[PDB]
Design a protein around this ligand. Structure first.
Ligand SMILES: COc1ccc([C@@H](Nc2ccc(C(=N)N)cc2)C(=O)NCc2ccccc2)cc1OC
Ligand SMILES: *[C@@H]1O[C@H](CO)[C@@H](O)[C@H](O)[C@H]1O
Ligand SMILES: *[C@@H]1O[C@@H](C)[C@@H](O)[C@@H](O)[C@@H]1O
Ligand SMILES: C[As](C)(=O)[O-]
Ligand SMILES: [Ca+2]
Ligand SMILES: [Ca+2]
Ligand SMILES: [Ca+2]
Ligand SMILES: [Ca+2]
Ligand SMILES: [Ca+2]
Ligand SMILES: [Ca+2]
Ligand SMILES: [Ca+2]
Ligand SMILES: [Ca+2]
Ligand SMILES: [Ca+2]
Lengths: 188, 142, 251
């Protein structure tokens, strides 16, 4: 039996999956001062969904280990604080209305795996003022940008002329993974 | 797509990529700029990873750039919601939910036992004291 | 204890105190009216095996109250695999001459079943170690029963996280901090390492040894009780042999 190695966290919108090599195990996840909770009992997979355990407190920093079976042989994963590391999915432009010279560009409040009551919280509900969206629009050869504390943009367009748009979720405070990929392009 | 003499018509993002499936050039024939055509192409051509309906047990699939995310119902976990929570009733899993001792049983459900001086209640998982001073309890706190 | 606090009178009812010729010697743990579990090295230099006393419901070594119950130790059992002066198999089972009276201040700690202890208790992160030992590596013992909460580590981590002495065998596990802030200490040897799980306390450790007390880059080492459950259990159901000292075979 060889101890598992190269443990990695794959998390997007809080859907957290711990993956590892090489290609029967049991995983335990805990917080710096919490009890250890076994997950994915005797799986033959080199992965384990830990989403449900980490959405219980995204602000927390979790640590996970993978026991190997033919005290057991194990390995520890990197520390992982969801709220500061989970990846922001690819945003999407829900709509865009024009009123004369100005145009209102909206970004969909995508849902997250984080549960509360009987529903999935949205990207806004969990990050609030921490999350802003960046607009990258254009007509002309150059580009223009805009930023928002909410999920809507209100820019001035040159009457008549046609434009295209592309937003991108961003969480400014973040040291790593502070920008999500670009959304699909949309033109008037 | 390009029908007969349709390329004679100027570029139209809607007609060619929305209303029809456009290639890369056709697309480049709309945006003109490469950086622009790429930003558009990257998604437009990614392909809906949810098409295979990967999520199970009533899950809901959400497409991503060369990937997907599954939103499961309460009783399910796993990358594809392929895990039944109600079937983890084993001793390694939270002591089989027993208050004291847990005993696995191949095939059937698990059993729960108690330490001496304690009795297993009808709930099948709890243990209540049977003596005035059962081990493990702190009288001045009980 | 180092960096802990005074166990309020009564909140450590299984904690025992061992005395030789009326002298503090080690801590113990009551697992029922007539049996006490302590550390083996505690009896390394004993001479008058007829002068061993066990004291229950003790707290303030400077005051006497009706909650104190002394008892003479009839038999001190040690695994025949234990070598005086060394660390492995640091466990001893002491039989009292007379049962004690279970009161509000004297209640036994539970001895768990092996698998429950290995598969569950082993993963409760924190546990409590206590005794009247040193309050500082160099300092003296304590008058009032002290208690402390320490985290458990799996041997592998204990090693990586420890500075390069005995090896951490499979008959011991580490618990404590390496910053030099908290840890049990010598005078606490034999004391319990009780784990709290779903409303009940169990015996999962015995204050065994370490690199000084609360030393930077070191953890406390406790005897792994779970490896001696059957052992203890058989002995408790065995007939009382002559002589205070009795080296039982182990396994
Ligand atoms: C390397 O082995 C030992 C060192 C110190 C202790 C030491 N006891 C002790 C207990 C706990 C720790 C600790 N938590 N850091 C620390 C110390 C001690 O001084 N006992 C006195 C004596 C020494 C050696 C044998 C018998 C009696 C015990 C050890 O082995 C049982
Ligand atoms: C459905 O399609 C997805 C996306 O490529 C694939 O990853 C799944 O395994 C399949 O079932
Ligand atoms: C998507 O969301 C999941 C959680 C379930 O409610 C499904 O019925 C829905 O399609
Ligand atoms: C392995 As150690 C007793 O030095 O922490
Ligand atoms: Ca066409
Ligand atoms: Ca065309
Ligand atoms: Ca159309
Ligand atoms: Ca057409
Ligand atoms: Ca062309
Ligand atoms: Ca064309
Ligand atoms: Ca063309
Ligand atoms: Ca896609
Ligand atoms: Ca006293």
């Amino acid at each position: 039996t060889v101890a598992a190695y190269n443990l990695t966290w794959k998390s997007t919108n809080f859907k957290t999956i711990l993956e590892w090599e090489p290609k029967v195990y049991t995983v335990q996840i805990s917080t710096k001062s919490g009890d250890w909770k076994s997950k994915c009992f005797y799986t033959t997979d080199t992965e384990c969904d830990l989403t449900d355990e980490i959405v219980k407190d995204v602000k927390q920093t979790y640590l996970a280990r993978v026991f190997s079976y033919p005290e057991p042989l194990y390995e520890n994963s990197p520390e992982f604080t969801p709220y500061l590391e989970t990846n922001l999915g690819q945003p999407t432009i829900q709509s865009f209305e024009q009123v004369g010279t100005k145009v209102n560009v909206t970004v969909e409040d995508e849902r997250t795996l984080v549960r509360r009551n009987n529903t999935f919280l949205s990207l806004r509900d969990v990050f609030g003022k921490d999350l802003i969206y960046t607009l990258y629009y254009w007509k002309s050869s150059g580009k223009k940008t805009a930023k928002t504390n909410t999920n809507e943009f209100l820019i001035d367009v040159d009457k008549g002329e046609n434009y295209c748009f592309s937003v991108q979720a961003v969480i400014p405070s973040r040291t790593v993974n502070r920008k999500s990929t670009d959304s699909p392009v949309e033109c008037m | 797509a390009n029908a007969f003499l349709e390329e004679l018509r100027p570029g139209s993002l809607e007609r060619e990529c929305k209303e029809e499936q456009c290639s890369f050039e056709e697309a480049r024939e709309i945006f003109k700029d490469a950086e622009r055509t790429k930003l558009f192409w990257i998604s437009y051509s990614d392909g809906d990873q949810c098409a295979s309906s990967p999520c199970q047990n009533g899950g809901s699939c959400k497409d991503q750039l060369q990937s997907y995310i599954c939103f499961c119902l309460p009783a399910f976990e796993g990358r594809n919601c392929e895990t039944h929570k109600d079937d983890q009733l084993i001793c390694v899993n939270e002591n089989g939910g027993c208050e004291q001792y847990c005993s696995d049983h191949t095939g059937t459900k698990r059993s729960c036992r108690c330490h001496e001086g304690y009795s297993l209640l009808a709930d099948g998982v709890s243990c209540t004291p049977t003596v005035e001073y059962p081990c493990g309890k702190i009288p001045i706190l009980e | 204890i180092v960096g802990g606090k005074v166990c309020p009178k009564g909140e450590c009812p299984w904690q025992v105190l061992l005395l030789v010729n009326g002298a503090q010697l080690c801590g113990g743990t009551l697992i029922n009216t007539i049996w006490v579990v302590s550390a083996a090295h505690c009896f390394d230099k004993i001479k008058n095996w007829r002068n061993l006393i066990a004291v229950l419901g003790e707290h303030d070594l400077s005051e006497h109250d009706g909650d104190e119950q002394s008892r003479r130790v009839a038999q001190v059992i040690i695994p025949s695999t234990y070598v005086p002066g060394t660390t492995n198999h640091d466990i001893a089972l002491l039989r009292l001459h007379q049962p004690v009276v279970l009161t509000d201040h004297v209640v036994p700690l539970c001895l768990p079943e092996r698998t429950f202890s290995e598969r569950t208790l082993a993963f409760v992160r924190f546990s409590l170690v206590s005794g009247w030992g040193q309050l500082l590596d160099r300092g003296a013992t304590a008058l009032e029963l002290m208690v402390l909460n320490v985290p458990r580590l799996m041997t592998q981590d204990c090693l990586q996280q420890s500075r390069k002495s005995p090896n951490i065998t499979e008959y011991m596990f580490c618990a404590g901090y390496s910053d030099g802030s908290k840890d049990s200490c010598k005078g606490d040897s034999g004391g319990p390492h009780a784990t709290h799980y779903r409303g009940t306390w169990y015996l999962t450790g015995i204050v065994s040894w370490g690199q000084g007390c609360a030393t930077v880059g070191h953890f406390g080492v406790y005897t792994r009780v779970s490896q001696y459950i059957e052992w203890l259990q058989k002995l408790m159901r065995s007939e009382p042999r002559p002589g205070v000292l009795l080296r039982a075979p182990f396994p």
